[PDB]
Design a protein around this ligand. Structure first.
Ligand code: TAD
Ligand code: TAD
Ligand code: ZN
Ligand code: ZN
Ligand code: ZN
Ligand code: ZN
Lengths: 374, 374
C-alpha cells in the first residue's frame, strides 16, 4: 500500500534542547528521486544523539535524532539502483556520494556531502521529508532514525544480508564500526603489537575487537572504573589497568609496563588530558595514537610538539575511517561469518516508546549499549 | 703515521654557553674497538649547533659541537667492518646501531643509542676521545665535527662514494636529508599532490626538492620574507605566498587557493603558531602535516583535537625519518646520479678558523647554508 502515499507514524521529536523526547504522530512524505524510505526495525542510542539535546551538537531543531540503525526498504524513489523494497539496510550518517575529492581518495571516507561540518538538518535538496501538524521537523545527519519510517538519500543507505539479525547489526551503523575501524583501518594495528585502549565503554570494546582482529598480542584496557574490566577481558584485553591504583603517572606505568611504550594507543574516553596521555605512552620513534572520538564542544588541548619530533603519528577519524557504502556490507558479511559478536555490547533492549528511558541509562552510564526495538 | 698515536689538532671549543668558540690545540686519542677516527674535510653550520651555545640544547660543556659533515677515515679501531682508512664518510648524529626496537622496526629510524634524548656528551662507553690541556672536552651527539680530527663509534659513520664532492655532500649529514626525508620518506608525498612548505630556509628548500622528487604537481612556498621566493622557485616552488600580503588568514587563503586544502603541509619554520596553521590547511579528511623541526626549548601549543577528527594525520621526525647507515649512501649515489643539486643551498663557504664568523651569518639569517672547509 504505502508506496507513493505519505505515511503517518510515531517518532520522537526534540522540539527544543535540553527537553525530553516526545512521541508524536508524524507524517513521512514519499521519496523524491534518489531517495529511499525505510521502515525502522531497531535503533541504538549513541551519546552523539544526546549531544544534540544538550545543545553541544548544534543542528536545526525541531529534529528527529538517531543515526545508529538497520531497517527494511518500503518504497524507493525514482532512479534508485542500489536497493529494492524489502532489502534490509543500514542508514549511513557518513554518506558515500561516490564523486567527490574524499570519495575517490583511497583513504578519505568523510564524504563531502556530510551534514556534520555545517548541519542544515535537511535532505540533500534543502528540504524535509517530515511534518508534525504542518510544522516541518528537521532531519538529522541525513538519517533521522528515531522514527518508525524515515527517508534517506541513496548515498546514505547501504544494502546488507537478508539473513542478518537487525537487532544486533544495527551497531555497525555507528558504535561498533567507529571503534573496530580505528584499530583495523585507521591505526592499522599489526600482528604482534601492543595496544593500549583508553576508556572501555561500547566503542572501546569495539577497538579491543579490532586489535584482536588485527592480531595485536597485547591489548591493555585502561579505565578508572574497575567494573569495566571483565567484559573488556572477555572481549580481548589481555590485562586491564585502573589509573587510581598507582602513585605514578599512567603513561609512565604504561611505557614502563611495555618496555618503551606501546605500539598503538587509542583514546575512547573523548577528553583532553587522556588524549595527550594516550599520545605519550605509545612508542617514541614509531608509536601511533588515534583519537577515536572528540565531543562537539571541544576546547584546545596543550601538547608539546616535541612528542611528535621523535616519530610519533597522531590521527583522528569519523566512522572508523571506513568508506560507508563500501564497508557496512562487508562488516555484516563478517558478522554473518561468526567473527565479531555484537552481543557483549548490548546490555539493554527497550521498546522504542521508552526512548527517554533509554537516554537516562546512557546518562548514568550503566549501559554499554541500549537498543530500541520498533 | 697517526694510526695508533694521539693526534694534536685545532678544534673549536665551547668552554661555556653564550660565549664564542675558541680555536684550541686539542689532542685526539686513538680509536678503541668499534671506533673510527675521521679527518674532517668540510662541516656545515646548522642552527642545532647554535642551540647548544644558547643553553637551549642542554648537553655537557665544554663541548666540541658540529654534526653536519663528511671527511676521510684516518685509523679504524679493532673490530671495524664497515669502513677502511681513506674512505670518504659522513658522521651520523642519528646512529644506526642495528639491534634495537627502533632499528629493526621498518619505519623507526631514531636509534636507541641516540645522545639527544638524554645528552651525556661521550662515546658509547661513557668516555671522551678529547682533552685540551688535561681537561676533558665532551663529544656532541657522538660526532663532534668542529674538530680537525674526530672519533665516532662504528654505528655513527657511513661510508660513501669516493668520487663524491665532500664540500657539497656534507649537507646530507643533516640539513638536506632532514627536509628531503620529510617529503620523500615521512609524509610520502604522492605524484600529483599539492604541497605547502612553511618557511624557506635551507631545510625548506630541501623539502621542496623532496616534493619535487615525489612528483607533487604544486609546491606552494610560504614565507613572510619575500626575498626567499626566487631560490625556492628555482628549486621547485610553483608559486610562493607572503602571509603579510593578505588581510585574510593564511590557512584560509591557502585552502581557498587549493579548493579544499592542500594534500601535504610541512612546517620548516619551527614555531607554534605556524605548526598548528600548517595543520589546518592541509585537507580535512586525508591531509598529512609534518613538523620537520621543533626547537629544544619548545613550549606547548594549543590545538583543537577537532582538526584530527575528520581524518588529518600529524607526524614528526628526526633526520627525515631516514635510517642513517642505510640511507646516507643512497642519498650520495643519487646526488652522484645528478638528481638533487646541493648547490643552491650553499651560499657561503668560509675556512674553518672563521667558525664564529660563520655563526654571526646564521644568526642574522642571510645565509642559506655556510660550509666551513678544513
Ligand atoms: N563525542 C564523540 O564523538 C565521542 C566518541 S567516544 C566519546 C566519549 O566516549 C563516550 C562514548 O564512548 P564510550 O562507548 O566509551 C561511552 P563512555 O562515556 O562510557 O566512555 C568513556 C569511558 O572512559 C572511562 N573513563 C573516564 N575518564 C577516564 C579517565 N580519566 N581515565 C581512564 N578512563 C576513564 C569511563 O569509565 C568510560 O568507560 C562519550 O560520552 C564521550 O565521553 N565521545
Ligand atoms: N630546532 C630545530 O630542530 C629546527 C629545525 S627547522 C627549525 C627552525 O628552522 C630554522 C632552521 O631551518 P631553516 O633552514 O628554515 C632556517 P630559518 O630559521 O631561516 O627558518 C625559518 C624560515 O621561516 C620563515 N618565517 C619565519 N616566521 C615565519 C612566519 N611566521 N610565517 C611564515 N614564514 C616565516 C623565515 O623567513 C625563514 O625562511 C631554525 O632556526 C628554527 O627557527 N628548528
Ligand atoms: Zn554515534
Ligand atoms: Zn563523497
Ligand atoms: Zn642539524
Ligand atoms: Zn638502534
Amino acid at each position: 500500500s504505502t508506496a507513493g502515499k505519505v505515511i503517518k507514524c510515531k517518532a520522537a521529536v526534540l522540539w527544543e534542547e535540553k527537553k525530553p523526547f516526545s512521541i508524536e504522530e508524524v507524517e513521512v512524505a514519499p521519496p523524491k528521486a534518489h531517495e529511499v524510505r525505510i521502515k525502522m526495525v531497531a535503533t541504538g542510542i549513541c551519546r552523539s544523539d544526546d549531544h544534540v539535546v544538550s545543545g553541544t551538537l548544534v543542528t536545526p531543531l525541531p529534529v528527529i535524532a538517531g543515526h545508529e540503525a538497520a531497517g527494511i526498504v518500503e518504497s524507493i524513489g525514482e532512479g534508485v539502483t542500489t536497493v529494492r523494497p524489502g532489502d534490509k539496510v543500514i542508514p549511513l550518517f557518513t554518506p558515500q556520494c561516490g564523486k567527490c575529492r574524499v570519495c575517490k581518495h583511497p583513504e578519505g571516507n568523510f564524504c563531502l556531502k556530510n551534514d556534520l561540518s555545517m548541519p542544515r538538518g535537511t535532505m540533500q535538496d534543502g528540504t524535509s521529508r517530515f511534518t508534525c501538524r504542518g510544522k516541518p521537523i528537521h532531519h538529522f545527519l541525513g538519517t533521522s532514525t528515531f522514527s518508525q519510517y524515515t527517508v534517506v538519500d541513496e548515498i546514505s543507505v547501504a544494502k546488507i544480508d537478508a539473513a542478518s539479525p537487525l537487532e544486533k547489526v544495527c551497531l555497525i551503523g555507528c558504535g561498533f564500526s567507529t571503534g573496530y575501524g580505528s584499530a583495523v583501518k585507521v591505526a592499522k594495528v599489526t600482528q604482534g603489537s601492543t595496544c593500549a585502549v583508553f576508556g572501555l565503554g561500547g566503542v572501546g570494546l569495539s577497538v579491543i575487537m579490532g586489535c584482536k582482529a588485527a592480531g595485536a598480542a597485547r591489548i591493555i584496557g585502561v579505565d578508572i572504573n574497575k567494573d569495566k574490566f571483565a567484559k573488556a577481558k572477555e572481549v580481548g584485553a589481555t590485562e586491564c589497568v585502573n589509573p587510581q591504583d598507582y602513585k605514578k603517572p599512567i603513561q609512565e606505568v604504561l611505557t614502563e609496563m611495555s618496555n618503551g611504550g606501546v605500539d598503538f594507543s587509542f583514546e575512547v574516553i573523548g577528553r583532553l588530558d587522556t588524549m595527550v596521555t594516550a599520545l605519550s605512552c605509545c612508542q617514541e620513534a614509531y608509536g601511533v595514537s588515534v583519537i577515536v572520538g572528540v565531543p562537539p564542544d571541544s576546547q584546545n588541548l596543550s601538547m608539546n610538539p616535541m612528542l611528535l619530533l621523535s616519530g610519533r603519528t597522531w590521527k583522528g577519524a569519523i566512522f572508523g575511517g571506513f568508506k560507508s557504502k563500501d564497508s557496512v556490507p562487508k562488516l555484516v558479511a563478517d558478522f554473518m561469518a561468526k567473527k565479531f559478536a555484537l552481543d557483549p555490547l548490548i546490555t539493554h533492549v527497550l521498546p522504542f516508546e521508552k526512548i527517554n528511558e533509554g537516554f537516562d541509562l546512557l546518562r548514568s552510564g550503566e549501559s554499554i549499549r541500549t537498543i530500541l526495538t520498533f
